Design a protein around this ligand. Structure first.
Ligand SMILES: NC(=O)c1cc[n+](COC[n+]2ccccc2/C=N/O)cc1
Ligand SMILES: *[C@@H]1O[C@H](CO)[C@@H](O)[C@H](O)[C@H]1NC(C)=O
Ligand SMILES: *[C@@H]1O[C@H](CO)[C@@H](O)[C@H](O)[C@H]1NC(C)=O
Length: 531
């Protein structure tokens, strides 16, 4: 301070910050990266609810991203951009509770609507610093204030001995909640409007947004929510207290460890030892299942998300939810034999039956038969191309498309204003093979407006498409309505079940989100599982 850029010095509750001026394609933006919002949850604080960060002295340098929360690093396809883009891009550390703010430059002179991003990655990975979550474009082009926070994942964020004091569960969700409290207190300092805060996230980040909707103390911290390909209901986003306890104690055993004693022993283990064993505690060979996720603790979650969306009053809530065209394909190449990014993955009937048992790992024999019966093409029951695509649909429908359907429906029936979409454009720059279609996670780079960066090699149409999506999302944040006061985007309702297609063509309205197949998963499967 003296010779420094006066536009980049800001004070928050904990002290003084110095940000950085970044170049976006249409002009500069302000970034404040690596702002601590919690005491490092290390040592005796592992597994504990986060504690608000204590004020610092001097000017904290906020010009670079901070550490990524310790996590498993995916190694299926080494050096291949398809997997690498999701991997940690800063040092892994338990000291990782930091958040990031982008704003116009100079800062808005009047209060601007805030978007808060929560990343996905199965509650076992992810980071707010990845290139695909870069807020410079939304800030520069839409004038948004954008916030994203790291939160603890894996065991560090989600290992629970329900009822204990030392490992109560859900602390990754409480990391997110603390960041939201930080926004309420401090965002006015950056030109943000704490009275207009829209949450958005994808996959597990979406489930997270969902859980904030369903958890009362989070409710006063935001006004609107966007759930991209993820929901708090469904088969992967939560586990019961019993199951959480069973996994935590199996994991303790695997690393050589009365809850207080078990937990103290876990606290002496190297971070990397926990990461090395976390995946071993799943009860069946699975895909789209994760070891350490939110637990129904009767605390953060007072009941299952199913019970809470069923009985909730959602009157003052606006919500944007949707899915990509091919939610399942991405997951098949990891753990279903016969699938691969490097060939067409034309599978046999035998491999379809086997993949159904992996895709629906909780299924009894009869339930699995029902799944196979429903997805088999009975004019061509052995055709490898249909079996390959049907396998994808099983996984995408069970895990994402049908839970989203159930969510939109319950939320509307109960007074929320809902807008639904299906995203159907495949990036021209996609490195996954064609058969995977428009895979899970590949809408994000358009919502954040990466196609605006000329060096990324997107097409001109893709550039205009990204601009449209950015408008929808920020209109929504701003007013609860994606429409600009072009074809209209009607609200989703139980009666008409309308949603739109997001692609290069103008909005097209459709009805029924896999209505027929989703009745199978949402109404019939549960009844069949008992017995
Ligand atoms: N710890 C876990 O629960 C877990 C689950 C799955 N995987 C690997 O999943 C494949 N995958 C990898 C990257 C993105 C999505 C899916 C690793 C850890
Ligand atoms: C594609 O590759 C996978 C793994 O290498 C293999 O199991 C599968 O059989 C291959 N597909 C065909 C039909 O060759
Ligand atoms: C974009 O295209 C140019 C020209 O071939 C190439 O040199 C550059 O590496 C490309 N960047 C990406 C990420 O595709």
């Amino acid at each position: 301070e003296g010779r420094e850029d006066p536009q980049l010095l800001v004070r928050v509750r904990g002290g003084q910050l110095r940000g950085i001026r970044l170049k976006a394609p249409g002009g500069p933006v302000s970034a404040f990266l690596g702002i601590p919002f919690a005491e490092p949850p290390v040592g005796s604080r592992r597994f504990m609810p986060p504690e608000p960060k204590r004020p610092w002295s001097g000017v904290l340098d906020a010009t670079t991203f901070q550490n990524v929360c310790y996590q498993y690093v995916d190694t299926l396809y080494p050096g291949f951009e398809g997997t690498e883009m999701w991997n940690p891009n800063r040092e892994l550390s338990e000291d990782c509770l930091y958040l990031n703010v982008w704003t116009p430059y100079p800062r808005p002179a009047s209060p601007t609507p805030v978007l808060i991003w929560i990343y996905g990655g199965g509650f076992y990975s992810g980071a707010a610093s990845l290139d695909v979550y870069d807020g410079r474009f939304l800030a520069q082009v839409e004038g948004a204030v954008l916030v994203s926070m790291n939160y603890r994942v894996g065991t560090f964020g989600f290992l629970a001995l329900p009822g204990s004091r030392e490992a109560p569960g859900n602390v990754g969700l409480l990391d997110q909640r603390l960041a939201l409290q930080w926004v309420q207190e401090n965002i006015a300092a950056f030109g943000g409007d704490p009275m207009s805060v829209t949450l958005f996230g994808e996959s597990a980040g979406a489930a997270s947004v969902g859980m904030h909707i369903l958890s009362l103390p989070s409710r006063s911290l935001f006004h609107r929510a966007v759930l991209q390909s993820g929901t708090p209901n469904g088969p992967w986003a939560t586990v019961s207290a019993g199951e959480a306890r069973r996994r935590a104690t199996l994991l303790a055993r695997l690393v050589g460890c009365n809850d207080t004693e078990l937990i103290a022993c876990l606290r002496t283990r190297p971070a990397q030892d926990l990461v090395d064993h976390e995946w071993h505690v799943l009860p069946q060979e699975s895909i789209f299942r994760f070891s350490f996720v939110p637990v129904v603790d009767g605390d953060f979650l007072s009941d299952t998300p199913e019970a809470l969306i069923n009985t909730g009053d959602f009157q003052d809530l606006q919500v944007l939810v949707g899915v990509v065209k091919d939610e399942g394909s991405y997951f098949l190449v990891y753990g279903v034999p016969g699938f691969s990014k490097d060939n067409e993955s034309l599978i046999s009937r035998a491999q379809f039956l086997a993949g159904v048992r992996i895709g629906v790992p909780q299924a009894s024999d009869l339930a699995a038969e029902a799944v196979v019966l429903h997805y088999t093409d009975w004019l061509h029951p052995e055709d490898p191309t249909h079996l390959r695509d049907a396998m994808s649909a099983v996984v995408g429908d069970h895990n994402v498309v049908c839970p989203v359907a159930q969510l939109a429906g319950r939320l509307a029936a109960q007074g929320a204003r809902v807008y639904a979409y299906i995203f159907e454009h495949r990036a021209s720059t996609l490195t996954w093979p064609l058969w995977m279609g428009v895979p899970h996670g590949y809408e994000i780079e358009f919502i954040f407006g990466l196609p605006l960066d000329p060096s990324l090699n997107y097409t001109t149409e893709e550039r205009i498409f990204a601009q449209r999506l950015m408008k929808y999302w920020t209109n929504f944040a701003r007013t609860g309505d994606p429409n600009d006061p072009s074809p209209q985007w009607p609200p989703y309702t139980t009666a008409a079940q309308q949603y739109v297609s997001l692609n290069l063509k103008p909005l097209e309205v459709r009805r029924g989100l896999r209505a027929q197949t989703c009745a199978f998963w949402n109404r019939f499967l549960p009844k069949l599982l008992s017995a």
